[model samples]
Target chain A: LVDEDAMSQIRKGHDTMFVVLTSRHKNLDTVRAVWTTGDIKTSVDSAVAINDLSVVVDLLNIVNQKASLWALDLCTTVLPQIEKLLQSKYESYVQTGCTSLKLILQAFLPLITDILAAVDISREERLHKCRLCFKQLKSISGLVKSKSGGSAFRELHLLMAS
Target chain B: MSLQMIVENVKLAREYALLGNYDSAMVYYQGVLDQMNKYLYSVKDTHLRQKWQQVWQEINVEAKQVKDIMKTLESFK
Candidate 1:
């Protein structure tokens, strides 16, 4: 499942789980009650707890699609796990983590920029944040380059260059 | 079915490239190429051979567009 079909599987799994976990529908209480049952709750929890690259991709897609719905929770919980996975010795884990990070950044970029603009932060503070963004982008590009051939990441390299 | 998926990936890649998400765009573009290869090789029907060839040519055009965009991005360096 972690091969060519991985992305669509991630998309479908995340969408299904997201609706079950997060949707505020008319039957919300009923849904919530069903989810809170011991077996179902444990199932969802354990599914999320699995430390696999596919799970990471699923979580990232969840955030990408429902940032306003799940951003805070994922930022606090799932993100740290992803960061930890990024530091994994497994090449696949690292590659997927980096790819997900790039997607997360793209999804959150507007919100992040809006927040930065809304805040009364100092110039130095803003610059520091910008530096952090650049640093992360640079690191992601470097990781991508090292993980695959230069032509494979030429688009990202062009992005970094620009 | 596989060709449809490859077409969707190419559309997504073009969208991401237009939006300046080159990393994601590139990934999808690569995916399109890989899927294209697998799908093309699996096409056994002589009746659909011409159609597949036409689609393959279109994909090659898109691949060249991607290459050109990469060159343009490279020139920014």
Candidate 2:
């Protein structure tokens, strides 16, 4: 129904995210990086899927929205402190198998937690802010635990800088 | 929202979640959930309605399961 290129982007969008996420089951970071960059490794090259990109794009859109609206208005007025963290590890994401998951979790969870704290402390004046703020925090926490296996509090405290 | 399309979307959402990018997974899953809701509420198109309704129920079940999966996955981190 859609044009080839448009469809290709749509298709690649979904495939890129899907492959990256699935690679996590086995902790396959090699393919993960390819998905993140939309560029495959040179050894055995192939076209990425569209569905994956859709997921990634869709996720980023939500993150952008949450950060822009929810995070900025309620918590901290930040665009995406997590963006750098997400982008910098493109290579490690492509590593295969679930072995490196621990390493990834160990490294990223603290950062994510710190983000939550920064947002929380920024909005400390309003007690009612907890619900909405926590909901967003829960989402992030859920993201980490469901996919990364880290303690929410531990991650949060680690992220909180003096 | 066709059954195949909805399920495919859900699967894609799961895939995205697996990537530690649950942000997109949530959106797609929310889309799936919304579509499923519409299918359930639609009164006309008996055949299509029934199909959609049934599929809607299935998606509901699937979403809950995925939520659980996401919860489990979250614990590891």
Candidate 3:
């Protein structure tokens, strides 16, 4: 129903700064790097659905890696900031059952908190990643306690970052 | 809009088709295809674009199958 190779970049006529504001534009702008995000995202999706706590522990490292990638994105200016936005927003909602969540979150929460604070501290600021990680930890922990145990994740449940 | 909806629609569409609800199944299949089409415009790399096109092709084939099945069921009636 459409041309296969030549969808006009209608937005190309716009200023670069304007283009930077929307993720939609960034996704279209960067294809190669997207492959990296795709790899981790697929694994996260797989680990998440199976509700594998062990895999999730491994996933946290990936999240940390992803955070560095995002920071580099800011440094290189390929894409822009989303770590806290990504993580806390995810924590803001949802719960699921899984063992050892409370223990694991307790293990990493402070680690991330320090990393989050270490980068820059004018007055010490942040928030998607903030609630998202903490809330997911809480949600999954709560579920653990509810089922009789419940808790959740950071950038684990909310809408994905591009 | 994100591709997450496609994940959900694919699940629902597949279930509907298997449950013998071709009508509902086709609706979601068409929807997924449309959403993917819209998403493709946002992809720029020729190679990446081709990969996405492949996904579109597969979904198109599945949608065709659903339509064919519906036709088959109708013809027998």
Candidate 4:
């Protein structure tokens, strides 16, 4: 979770910044699919669908798109929908919605990254649904989170599901 | 089993199922349900205990979903 202490520490030097540390798997895990965090976004549909490999990949990719946008990546996944619309080819999409990008990443990327690495992968990794069944595997990680009591069940509850 | 562990097992099962590894996925799902049953029977925490019901319900739904996924996978070959 993005506790005040962790948020403060992440933003220690900069006027604003956030960092999240997690014990999740180092490789792609099924947490996003089980939890459905990937479904929360728009532009980038996940290869893993509910397992949401695409969503995670997109989130990580956003950072590589811009450096100043780093600060904006921490907000909410919904930010991406609007930012995706706002993306312009002026700078070759180089400066794509830096503000929204940073907001979403700072808030979520760490938690998703943590769960993907530690929680989900503990089960399996090569079990991706994308390349396997022509991508028929689709299910929200939320169902698993709610059933499993994953922290995302609590943290992501208000953000997307309600 | 702890709450997190139960969920992780199910997630693992779902992942395996997604990857078309029904046999391995079934093992994990069965393990998840078994652990959840035991945890529910033993847990004293009312709130946490309630989660057992939620888990079983999800697994029940997932059971059917996995069955369909398995059928689809079988058809693929």
Instruction: Identify the leading candidate in terms of DockQ.
Output: 2
**TM-score of chain B taken alone, every candidate:** 0.74, 0.57, 0.92, 0.72
Please tell me which predicted candidate would have the highest TM-score against the true structure. 3
Interface RMSD of each: 17.8, 11.0, 20.1, 15.9
Regions of candidate 1 where Cα sits further than 4 Å from its true position: A1-162, B1-4
* lDDT (CA) per prediction: 0.50, 0.45, 0.46, 0.42
Model 1 lDDT, full chain set: 0.50
In candidate 4, stretches whose alpha carbon ends up further than 4 angstroms from where it belongs are A1-162, B72-77
| Tens digits of lDDT, candidate 2, B1-77 | 46456556767766666555555777887897796576456546566556545545544554454464455344322
**Local accuracy of candidate 4 as per-residue lDDT tens digits, A1-162:** 222332233223221100110111211223334334534343233333435453354344433433323322322324434334333445434234433434443464444434323253523422332122212111222332353343423443344331
Q: Which lDDT tens digits does candidate 2 get at residues A63-138? A: 4534433433424322123322322456443222122323433453344344444335644543344444455444
Interface RMSD of 4: 15.9
Error of 3 at A155 (Å): 74
> B1-77 in candidate 1: lDDT tens per residue?
45456657867866665444556877886787677667666767775555556555554555555455444333311
Ranking by TM-score: 3, 1, 2, 4
Judged by lDDT against the true structure, how good is candidate 2?
Answer: 0.45
lDDT winner between 3 and 4, please give it: 3
lDDT of 3 by residue, B1-30 (tens): 455566667667766655556678899989
Candidate that beats the other on lDDT, 2 or 3, i.e. the better one: 3
**All DockQ scores:** 0.01, 0.05, 0.02, 0.01
Alpha-carbon TM-score of each model against the true structure: 0.31, 0.30, 0.32, 0.30
Write the number of the candidate with greater DockQ, choosing between 1 and 2: 2
